[PDB]
């Protein structure tokens, strides 16, 4: 089984290593490529034939190898270098592709951003198909953790909420979303609905009025 | 250069799927193609391969009495076909094109994989709702996609002509058993008045696609 450490860590601008361990039978008489999976998303070539980068690739990734084990470096860390990267490899004895577990790197220190909050309430149609959902939009934050609560006028509303878990914007902020559907009679009662996001220990609170 | 694949689909255990790989350029050339699964939240996991150039196959040991991997050149599409399905083969399934010319050879050209769900849930397609701009909501606009079963949809803007400024959430997994998502766009206000905005949802494992008209 071909191994790495299930996470790394730097500061933007600093360099990274990830290595992968193997065996006679696999690296020891193979070559080594690496390869790159930004969240939700396929995963990319980033080195091939141990130290060879395909057209388009950054030349801050660079490989290298030596006997059983392999080194993938990364300097200049950038928060778009935050994903799990992979070796992968060829044991011709078995006649298989074999990867490594993956390491996940973490760009730590970001700078924090407090979270923008949009709120949506039912669309005419839904209301008209005799259900009723209001959609809570979270976004430009880090870090990307955040705890989404829901009030109908100054009651607190815990069933029929769901949230999603916080993935990155294309600018590497973070985005959530939240839901609240409603019965009719709580549709027919309230006077607005408010989202409140707790980040950091601070709470952004949106309320719309249908 | 790019490796197309569907979404895709819904399996009872103990069934069979068939991956489908094609190939833009019209050719496999003297390259392998590889099957490579990813089971939501794990690592890599190579299944087969094969160099279509000269019908040179292998699969992974773990898969041998279950894996068959083709290729056909008429269409420059590859396939693999898991039988027996379990409840552990419900993954993404990757083909992905190699970097010899039939041996140092790597995966260099990835699909955008095949989510396969083994479930004995029935199939639901989803309910696509707009989320209208206001003075509320640069403005914001979306579309809601309700209540569908199983993963994935995907979502596009004006079949393709918007992307700038657009994101689409992860689902979440209600406790009826069924899914929910959305996509949202940032867009300059003045645009509200000057074009319109669909949004294409498409559920390819209940063969759905909804063109959603989103007006302020
Ligand atoms: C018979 C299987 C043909 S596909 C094949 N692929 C080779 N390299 C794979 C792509 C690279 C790879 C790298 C990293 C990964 F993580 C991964 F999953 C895959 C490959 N390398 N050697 N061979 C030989 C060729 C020979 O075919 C016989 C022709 O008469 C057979 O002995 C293979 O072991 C490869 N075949």
């Known amino acids: 089984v071909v191994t790495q450490p299930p996470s790394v860590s730097a500061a933007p601008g600093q360099k990274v290593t990830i290595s992968c361990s193997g065996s006679?039978?696999?690296?020891?008489?193979?070559?080594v490529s690496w390869y790159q999976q930004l969240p939700g998303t396929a995963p990319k070539l980033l080195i091939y034939?141990?130290?060879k980068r395909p057209s388009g690739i950054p030349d801050r990734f660079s490989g290298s190898k030596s006997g059983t084990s392999a080194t993938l470096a990364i300097t200049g860390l950038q928060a778009g270098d935050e994903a799990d990267y992979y070796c992968?490899?060829?044991?011709?004895?078995?006649?298989?592709?074999?990867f490594g577990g993956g390491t996940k790197v973490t760009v730590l220190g970001q700078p924090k951003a407090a979270p923008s909050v949009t709120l949506f309430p039912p669309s005419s149609e839904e209301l008209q198909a005799n259900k009723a959902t209001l959609v809570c939009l979270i976004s430009d934050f880090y870090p990307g953790a955040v705890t989404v609560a829901w009030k109908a006028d100054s009651s607190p509303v815990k069933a029929g909420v769901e949230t999603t878990t916080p993935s990155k914007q294309s600018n590497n902020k973070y985005a959530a979303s939240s839901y609240l559907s409603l019965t009719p009679e709580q549709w027919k009662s309230h006077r607005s609905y408010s989202c409140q996001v707790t980040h950091e220990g601070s709470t952004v609170e949106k309320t719309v009025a249908p | 250069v790019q490796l197309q694949e569907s979404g895709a689909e819904v399996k009872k255990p103990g069934s069979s799927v068939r991956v489908s790989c094609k190939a833009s350029g019209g050719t496999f050339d003297s390259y392998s193609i590889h099957w490579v699964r990813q089971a939501p939240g794990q690592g890599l996991e190579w299944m087969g391969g094969?160099?279509?150039?000269?019908?040179?196959?292998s699969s992974a040991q773990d898969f041998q009495a279950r894996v068959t991997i083709s290729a056909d050149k008429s269409t420059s599409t590859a396939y693999m076909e898991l039988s027996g399905l379990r409840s552990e083969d419900t993954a993404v399934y990757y083909c992905?094109?190699?970097?010899?010319?039939?041996?140092?050879?790597?995966?260099?050209?990835w699909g955008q994989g095949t989510l396969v769900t083994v479930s004995s849930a029935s199939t639901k397609g989803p309910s696509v709702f707009p989320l209208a701009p206001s003075s509320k909501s640069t403005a914001a606009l979306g579309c809601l996609v309700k209540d569908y079963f199983p993963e994935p949809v995907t979502v596009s803007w004006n079949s393709g002509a918007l992307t700038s400024g657009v994101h689409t959430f992860p689902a979440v997994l209600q406790s009826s058993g069924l899914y929910s998502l959305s996509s949202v766009v940032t867009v300059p206000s003045s645009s509200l008045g000057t074009q319109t905005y669909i949004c294409n949802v498409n559920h390819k494992p209940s063969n759905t696609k909804v063109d959603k008209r989103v007006e302020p």
């Open positions: 992905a094109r190699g970097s010899h010319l039939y041996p140092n050879d790597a995966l260099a050209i």
């Open positions: 006679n039978s696999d690296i020891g008489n193979n070559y």
């Open positions: 094969i160099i279509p150039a000269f019908g040179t196959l």
């Open positions: 992968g490899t060829w044991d011709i004895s078995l006649s298989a592709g074999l």
């Open positions: 034939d141990n130290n």
